Amino acid sequence: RNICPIKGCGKNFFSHKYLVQHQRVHSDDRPLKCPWKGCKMTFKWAWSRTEHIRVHTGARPYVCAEPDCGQTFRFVSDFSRHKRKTGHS
DNA sequence: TTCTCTGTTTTG
DNA sequence: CAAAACAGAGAA
Ligand SMILES: [Zn+2]
Ligand SMILES: [Zn+2]
Ligand SMILES: [Zn+2]
């Protein structure tokens, strides 16, 4: 199997490629930058970025497809917890 | 709660 | 295939 060599997280990963990508966890480097003017937030992960951006735009893209629901959510986490505790879609 | 992290799945 | 998106975990 695929295992992180860093003593302290001997975590196991489905792929080797993601074993490489995983290493950013252990660096303090934060390559990805917020694109919003004068915001100094940084990330290691694009998905963090993507979602962070909607705090600036206030967008609420996740829209419940279930009839007589129609709540919306900014982040995926909220939508997944939601259908978990409702069973919609 | 609101928001970020991260491992795996899905997408194009 | 890799980039995007998911799902649920983790911070605050
Ligand atoms: Zn590790
Ligand atoms: Zn920002
Ligand atoms: Zn719903």
Author numbering: 1265 to 1353
What does the article say, verbatim?
The RELATIVE OF EARLY FLOWERING 6 protein (REF6/JMJ12), a Jumonji C (JmjC) domain—containing histone demethylase, specifically demethylates H3K27me3 at its target loci. REF6 has intrinsic DNA-binding ability and specifically recognizes its target sequence (CTCTGYTY motif, Y = T or C) via tandem zinc-finger (ZnF) domains located at its C-terminus. ZnF domains adopt the canonical ββα fold, with a small β-sheet packed against a helix in a globular structure, and wrap more than one turn of the DNA double helix, interacting with DNA in the major groove with a classic α-helix. Structural analysis demonstrates that CHG methylation is unfavorable for REF6 binding and attenuates REF6-binding affinity.
Although the overall structures of the REF6 ZnF domains were similar between complexes with methylated or unmethylated DNA oligos, there are minor conformational changes when DNA strands carrying the methyl-group. Further analysis by isothermal titration calorimetry (ITC) between REF6-ZnFs and the DNA probes with or without 5mCs revealed that 5mCs lead to great reduction in the binding affinity to the CTCTGYTY motif. In combination with EMSA assay, the biochemical and structural studies demonstrated that DNA methylation at the CTCTGYTY-motif, especially at the CTG core, is sufficient to abolish (or severely attenuate) the affinity of REF6-ZnF for this DNA sequence.
